[PDB]
Design a protein around this ligand. Structure first.
Ligand SMILES: Nc1ncnc2c1ncn2[C@@H]1O[C@H](COP(=O)(O)OP(=O)(O)NP(=O)(O)O)[C@@H](O)[C@H]1O
Ligand SMILES: Nc1ncnc2c1ncn2[C@@H]1O[C@H](COP(=O)(O)OP(=O)(O)NP(=O)(O)O)[C@@H](O)[C@H]1O
Ligand SMILES: Nc1ncnc2c1ncn2[C@@H]1O[C@H](COP(=O)(O)OP(=O)(O)NP(=O)(O)O)[C@@H](O)[C@H]1O
Ligand SMILES: Nc1ncnc2c1ncn2[C@@H]1O[C@H](COP(=O)(O)OP(=O)(O)NP(=O)(O)O)[C@@H](O)[C@H]1O
Ligand SMILES: NC(=[NH2+])NCCC[C@H](N)C(=O)O
Ligand SMILES: NC(=[NH2+])NCCC[C@H](N)C(=O)O
Ligand SMILES: NC(=[NH2+])NCCC[C@H](N)C(=O)O
Ligand SMILES: NC(=[NH2+])NCCC[C@H](N)C(=O)O
Lengths: 380, 386, 386, 386
């Protein structure tokens, strides 16, 4: 029996690698994806072999991540519960996609991940796995073992020679998420110094910085006149937005499995892209199309948040969003200053910005008012 | 014939007052509402009499404005096309409501206003009027007169004794709007010094300021522990957020009459309230309720923007929003700093948050069954696709 | 330990009553609700006591069923996946509501039902139970026992001395549902003579029959001029519609649990009410209100179907639907003929219909301006396409 | 100048053709489209030349109508206000399309139609024309002439010389619409013998008739095993359904221009197609995709009804509906009997139905976990209410 483990190189997946070998008397193939966490994945791959993996794989997936998951999501204007730009949410389908592919190639009957039984990640990983390979076997150790606390887990790792290192973090090219520990009290502000991807607004440059972002067909293709690949472009905007402290959100969200959770997120590049997109859309999209689009975005957002990426509903809505986004061609000009992003200009080759006479308005108004006047007369 | 004119006190409504009297051989009753435009309404009232009004009425409607129009709208989370908090939009129904009221009291068969034929305000004024008094006659001079240019309008004014004087502004307790002129080029950043209600972030305090807003039943009732009436509360938050340069928006919007236009808005108090409201809702509203509510907010926003305030669709949706909003009770803690509003905390008497469920309602294993069932249709799809 | 069992009086809940006693060694309180199954619940109550119940309760809930469940649902125009009027769906919450009431009165820590692990009813019973009493314990024998076949169950019944006798059916005041067995093949028409509530259309009267239904406030209050209580009214329309074979539908629906299921339903009275309601609404509801209401109906429907009756989302939407329904006052005249229901007329005290607006409230030029304004964005669009 | 006139060959467009020759003294080009009105279109073309038309054109557009307009609409499951299948609505864009095409080919500056200023047709014609050629000049005689009454028009006709003859009719391959006259009273049943396309239910065969419709990637491609082109297929289903009296609807609808109107429609073929489609969808579409699609259908319906066919909103939604419809491949079996259509069977090569998931990937106990997790937020809510 072989098992493809989503291995991040940390303590838990290291413990998991050992636990899987003994518990399932299985050969474990480790997989570590480079999605912009800011770590040398090769070090994780080598730790996996030291830990006991029969094979360890590491892949640079930053470009596939931005082009095939982040970009399509952004085209939809996806925002969960008013603020969450879904940084962790869209990255999970990508990881599981490769787990299942590797499982196929290696002849493995199962896959494993270290997401807990109380979060969203477990759902995202498994819904994707099942959607792509229906008879795949999934093993989620957190829902199968009986560790009674951290102490017991550190003891288990020390016993296997696994080296042992106030909140939980998840970082990738789109954002860095923070939750748990001290963050659990929604009345308490995050502690100073917690953020890593964005500069503290109180420490941002004293002068504002202008940035231009070009969109061609619904996707951003250039920054300040320089054409950049998907991953390179997000990276650049992260650098630019980050220096100014842009993209910080603090919310109490509703998880898919039932409870509320306090989360903090920094999405510098994606936040600039959100406003840049809407800026270009303001000139290229039709009024009714836009209004219909905005009423569907929230639904799309929850699909991503819940884990229904490789699902027919999401694919169907994507057909609508992509259609609409094809008209988003132009340039947005933004002004960045101490934590904030300001749209300051926009232009487009086929802008709809700027015939009748005042007289037509009276008619328009009379007809629009008819049903209201009738209703009024009936009330008498 | 009597005509009740929505009189702002400026050049155009003064020109209109004289124009109406002669064109319609009627007497004009001028109505000026104080909705926080930062001017002395009694001066417009007196100017109306000097311009020829048979009667001039001026009313302080700040409290009614915020209590009966702004609060109801905020309750619904209304936001037009992603950023417009509807500052000018919700004020129009209030004005027209009083116009129709005064017309009935004065025995006036018609009402008038100085909104142009190419904007949204004309629709808001008239849809409200017709909805409240179906037989009312509406006179909109811009759509009727033969004035050809500004030059001629000035000559007419000067001939009639009316005193004469880079963009058009509309200010009230909720915001200040700027559009037209130099703002007509969507690629040009607005001019320096344009903003009035808010301080440029570059000049905002170096020290962030914490502000707490208490919501009792969907509406804000206190700021930093001090109980304030609707208008006093909005005023307070404009002062606080204004100093920090909060609430600035720059957008190209879609007008109801069919064309796009570049608008700039500063809504300090309203912006703080928008995020404060959502902060309290994050603890007091159910997941499914919240998601449904957010999908209807945009529709409600276009209704307000188009002018369908006193319309059945709007009142029906208001029943939904008011039901949901009744649960919004708690306190939001925000951090203001150079143009931004950061939510840093929230608490509520009946908060649905239980860290009991997040720290390390079921045991992990229940999650497996949940996933299996949720995945069934997807697995079936995959098997069929073979 | 005490366990309140939702007892229908059939073979399975009889086997379950025994099973609960043996498995848990608890006192079992059988509850049978009369919701129009066309069964004498007092027989079931007696059989329950014979089967071993420590206490058996039988309540007539026909009026509560229609008044507090069917009517609120009908006001929303709830229809699941194009054709399902939710007959079985709205009944479950009522039953679970009493199961928990009784458990609390008797001091029973648990409730039990005989819905299987493959369907929707399990979710409906349990979601309302947990929603009303969060610490209640639920026992669903179908998900806990070892019986591996029908034959095994019958033997267990005999070994326990319980009386023993091509599809499963569920009947109540709203409809009769048929699914399973021969019906599992979606390409096979239901067998002849299966329907029980409606007469076969080929055997229905040769002369159409006219019926009028009065609505006052969103709910039906009279049939052919006779005031009738909710349950009596639904009963009456079932008699009238059934005689004509009205209300039959055949669909393959999506269960909440993931798979498709072939179901057949007969809802005579409800079908008449569905069309009668829309008929009165056509004169009493505003265009925009109607269009908005219709786009929310499908959502409310899935909530009911899934089992989210005592859920904040449903109660929120209910506030909207109730608000809109308050105007539905008038009379619908329908024609019934061999399985079909035809709306032939409608009237209302405050009908918004006006023949003068259509007979050959504005002049022709108004329409021209309306069209021009509506066309503006389309023309700018074509011009840019150039 | 040149004017292209949408000419139906009837009294009014004949009067309109003269009116155009006299008033504008222009060269009128008549255009008559054959879209299944069952009216020898060539008769209409000769009469146009006989009336002063310097050129009359007649085209067989039946196939284009069904393939490019009816099918895309049905693909979306479009239904206006619960019953209207949009028969007249989708035909108008097709006509205006050719008018504008012919105007470009004839160097004509304007186009004209005889829809009145009180209905929706004028909007459909004009929105289509403006969207296709923003520069186009439109002339709507009903809104421009001085005639008051039939008497007046009648004499004017005799005068110039035009043959001269209870409700108004509009017929095409999809349906026949009836409204006006005796139909204006919402309480008055339609007059016996009014219907033309459908046999009276009471006069329909005593024996039910089964029919099968095959769908391929969203569109009907065969009936009872015989492959038929779009127009031939709709024609065939009209014949089969008509003989049984299928597809009759009687409603009071909300017109786009503001007033309610009583309309009667018979859509035999289209009605069979509506139920056949949903039947194939019940096996080929995913639950969540279906539920989403149905909540959007109504919006697409009003877009068609209002006249926004060649509009970005409609084309955008079309991309969604087209994507979803591509999966609709299979066969539906329906039973026709005296005015009703009953789905009795359905099958598909890629059916998502699995008898094994329902008969006695699925484990009963997974349902408990599913239920507990779904119940969590409801339990927390209840506990907080203490
Ligand atoms: N970059 C990655 N490549 C492969 N799998 C990943 C990757 N990142 C996260 N995962 C999966 O996600 C789980 C991580 O959830 P997370 O909250 O980040 O926990 P963790 O405590 O950091 N794991 P570890 O780093 O081994 O201590 C891991 O158990 C992995 O299965
Ligand atoms: N506070 C108010 N009281 C009464 N009527 C008002 C008030 N504010 C605005 N209006 C109406 O709205 C129109 C104003 O449109 P707006 O763009 O503000 O023009 P204007 O510049 O104010 N007119 P004027 O100031 O008289 O030259 C006026 O013509 C009034 O009819
Ligand atoms: N009228 C009722 N009163 C109380 N409980 C009911 C009633 N009707 C249905 N139930 C509940 O619903 C379950 C019925 O599921 P169903 O598929 O109809 O099975 P069943 O065949 O009726 N059981 P039985 O009649 O005992 O053989 C029962 O187990 C009850 O818990
Ligand atoms: N088959 C067609 N070909 C071209 N234009 C048409 C056609 N059918 C309808 N129209 C247009 O639609 C208008 C008809 O509206 P309708 O209510 O059918 O009136 P009408 O009574 O049929 N006109 P007429 O037949 O000339 O007496 C006509 O003025 C035409 O411009
Ligand atoms: N494994 C993690 N640390 N992920 C944190 C959760 C991210 C965020 N709560 C989400 O639902 O996307
Ligand atoms: N009279 C005015 N200055 N009105 C300004 C328009 C405000 C904004 N464009 C709106 O439509 O609400
Ligand atoms: N116990 C029963 N036989 N129930 C009938 C099932 C009813 C229908 N399929 C529903 O899900 O509501
Ligand atoms: N030309 C006609 N008589 N058309 C009848 C209008 C049909 C239907 N009421 C509609 O709005 O489409």
């Amino acid at each position: 029996m072989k098992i493809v483990l989503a291995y991040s190189g940390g303590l838990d997946t290291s413990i998991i690698l050992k636990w899987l070998k003994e518990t399932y008397r299985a050969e474990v193939i480790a997989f570590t994806a480079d999605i912009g966490q800011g770590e040398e994945v090769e070090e994780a791959r080598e730790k996996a072999l030291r830990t006991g993996a029969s094979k360890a794989i590491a892949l640079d997936l930053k470009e596939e991540f931005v082009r095939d998951f982040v970009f399509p999501m952004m085209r939809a204007g996806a925002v969960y519960e008013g603020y969450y730009l879904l940084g962790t949410s869209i990255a999970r389908p990508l990881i599981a996609k490769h787990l299942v592919r590797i499982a196929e190639e290696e002849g493995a009957e199962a896959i494993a991940h270290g997401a807990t039984g109380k979060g969203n990640d477990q759902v995202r990983f498994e819904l994707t796995a099942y959607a792509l390979k229906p008879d795949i076997k999934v093993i989620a150790p957190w829902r199968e073992w009986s560790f009674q606390g951290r102490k017991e887990m550190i003891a288990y790792a020390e016993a296997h020679g696994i080296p042992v290192p106030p909140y939980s973090m998840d970082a990738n090219l789109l954002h860095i998420s923070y939750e748990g520990g001290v963050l659990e009290d929604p009345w308490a502000e995050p502690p100073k110094g917690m953020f890593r991807m964005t500069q503290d607004p109180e420490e941002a440059p004293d002068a504002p910085e202008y940035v231009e972002v070009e969109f061609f067909e619904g996707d951003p293709v250039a920054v300040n006149g320089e054409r950049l690949s998907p991953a390179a472009l997000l990276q650049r905007l992260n650098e630019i937005g980050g220096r100014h402290g842009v993209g910080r959100v603090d919310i109490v969200e509703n998880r898919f499995v039932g409870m509320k959770s306090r989360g903090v997120y920094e999405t510098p590049g994606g936040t600039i892209l959100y406003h840049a997109r809407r800026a270009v859309e303001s000139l290229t999209l039709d009024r009714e199309v836009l209004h219909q689009r905005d009423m569907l975005s929230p639904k799309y957002a929850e699909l991503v948040y819940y884990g229904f990426w490789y699902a027919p509903e999401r694919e169907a809505l994507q057909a609508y969003f992509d259609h609409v986004a094809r008209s988003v061609t132009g340039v947005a000009r933004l002004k960045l200053y101490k934590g904030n992003v300001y749209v300051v200009g926009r232009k487009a080759p086929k802008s709809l910005y700027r015939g009748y006479d005042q007289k037509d308005a009276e008619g328009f108004i009379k007809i629009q008012a008819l049903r209201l006047r009738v209703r009024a007369l009936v009330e008498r």
